């Protein structure tokens, strides 16, 4: 036999509209349409009727725009932060194929789409033909990006750290907030060096924190290891840093999204001595998706 | 503009710092294994020769004689006060003390050589460690001619 009916969604601007990509599990890359907070979603629900002769008895057809946050792949732990409905058909029949117009006016999309370890945030259109025992359901995924402008305050990070009477350094990164294709311009200045340093590197670390209160799970992933020194410095030596963030394709910093999860980035500076002992200093940086002019 | 050539501006390095010798010099040699005693008393000692320029070490050069038990005492003291994960010693080989083996037992040369390297391995790790250099036991071991086991651990 097969299926009696097949649901297909086609957006009104399905030719001109820009798409975007998403890294899922095992290195797979999906491509869905791109949307922005405030935009209207509109199109056609097209029902292909497959079994000619037969009839489809339903108790109503609808389409939903859905934005939600899924935790630990646990269906019971899904949380919808946006839900809009358009009833397309009353209870009735379908003998042949038919389409239905829909439009969701100026749709609020407060958060950016994200697929992590213990968290997913996704938007989609869900068409539902309601039947007596089992609904025909079709999901249709969308990407939402959250944009921002150049920040009001952006101070350089500058810090004197060390181990007492062994190593003193002063590191400086040129900003606290870097856009996704920005550049870490910085320097490491050595004030006291009484250990034997083999090499030094800057690392980019992405923490994904899930849960509420004492319920807290942090998933850490070391996105970049970037060597910046090779060999022993002496005091008074300055080492330059120029690390292009474009190379590693990170997400924006996302802080307490719906009071459910965070995603934060850190600059972990690490020096390594001759006996492989490892001295470090972590510093949070905010990432943000820059709005291109237009 | 065709290339992003941005760097932060640097302070010129003072020429004394730039050329003058580095301040992280520390080498410890374990050498010259020697029997001390006769008969059942016998044990091997090694020369622990230090060269440094770190202010914390109270002699720039030192030479002392140490026993493998002393190395165990150092490691044992560091495991209590220091809170440093201390590296391993090359190992107490008890069954080498047993009589009528097919080798010279505790005074076998392939043994003493291999142990000697392990102690050099151990002491250079321990002595290079920052948190370890504070503790009184390390200086006591490297630079006092005899260790005073009845001591109160400081620093």
């Amino acid at each position: 036999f097969g299926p009696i009916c097949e649901i297909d969604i086609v957006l009104n601007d399905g030719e001109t509209r820009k798409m975007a990509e998403m890294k899922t599990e095992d290195g797979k890359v999906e491509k869905h349409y791109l949307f922005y907070d405030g935009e209207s979603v509109s199109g056609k629900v097209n029902l292909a009727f497959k079994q000619p002769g037969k009839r489809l008895e339903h108790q109503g057809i609808r389409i939903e725009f859905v934005g939600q946050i899924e935790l630990f792949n646990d269906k019971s732990n899904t949380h919808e932060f946006v839900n809009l409905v358009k009833e397309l058909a009353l209870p009735g029949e379908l003998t042949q194929s038919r389409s239905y117009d829909f439009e969701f006016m100026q749709v609020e999309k407060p958060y950016e789409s994200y697929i992590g370890a213990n968290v997913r945030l996704r938007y989609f259109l869900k068409v539902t033909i309601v039947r007596r025992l089992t609904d025909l359901v079709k999901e249709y995924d969308l990407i939402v990006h959250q944009l921002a402008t150049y920040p009001d305050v952006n101070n350089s990070i500058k810090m004197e750290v060390g181990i007492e009477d062994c190593l003193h350094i002063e590191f400086e990164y040129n900003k606290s907030k870097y856009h996704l294709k920005d550049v870490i311009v910085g320097k490491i200045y050595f004030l006291l060096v009484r250990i034997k340093i083999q090499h030094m590197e800057l690392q980019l670390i992405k923490k994904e924190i899930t849960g509420i209160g004492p319920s807290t799970t942090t998933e850490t992933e070391t996105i970049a290891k970037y060597e910046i020194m090779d060999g022993a410095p002496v005091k008074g030596e300055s080492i330059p840093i120029r690390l292009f963030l474009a190379g590693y394709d990170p997400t924006p910093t996302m802080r307490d999204v719906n009071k459910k999860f965070s995603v934060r980035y850190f600059l972990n500076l690490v020096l390594v001595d001759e006996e492989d002992r490892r001295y470090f200093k972590q510093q949070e940086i905010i990432l943000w998706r820059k709005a291109p002019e237009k | 503009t065709v290339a992003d050539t941005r760097r932060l501006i640097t302070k010129p390095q003072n020429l004394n710092d730039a050329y003058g010798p580095p301040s992280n010099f520390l080498e410890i040699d374990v050498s010259n294994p020697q029997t001390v005693g006769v008969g059942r008393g016998r044990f091997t000692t090694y020369e622990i020769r230090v060269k440094t320029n770190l202010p914390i070490f109270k002699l720039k050069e030192s030479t002392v004689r140490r026993r493998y038990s002393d190395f165990e005492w150092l490691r044992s003291e560091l495991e209590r006060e220091s809170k440093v994960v201390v590296p391993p010693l090359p190992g107490k080989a008890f069954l080498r003390q047993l009589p009528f083996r097919g080798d010279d037992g505790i005074f076998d040369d392939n043994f003493i050589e291999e142990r000697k390297q392990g102690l050099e391995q151990f002491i250079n790790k321990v002595a290079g460690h920052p948190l370890a250099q504070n503790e009184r036991c390390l200086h006591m071991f490297l630079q006092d001619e005899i260790i005073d086991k009845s001591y109160t651990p400081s620093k």
Binding site: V161, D276, R277, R278, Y279, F280, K281 | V84
Partner: peptide, 10 residues
């Protein structure tokens, strides 16, 4: 396995 020491502010 490999020692990791946090650098303190002065």
């Amino acid at each position: 396995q490999p020692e990791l020491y946090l650098l303190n502010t002065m």
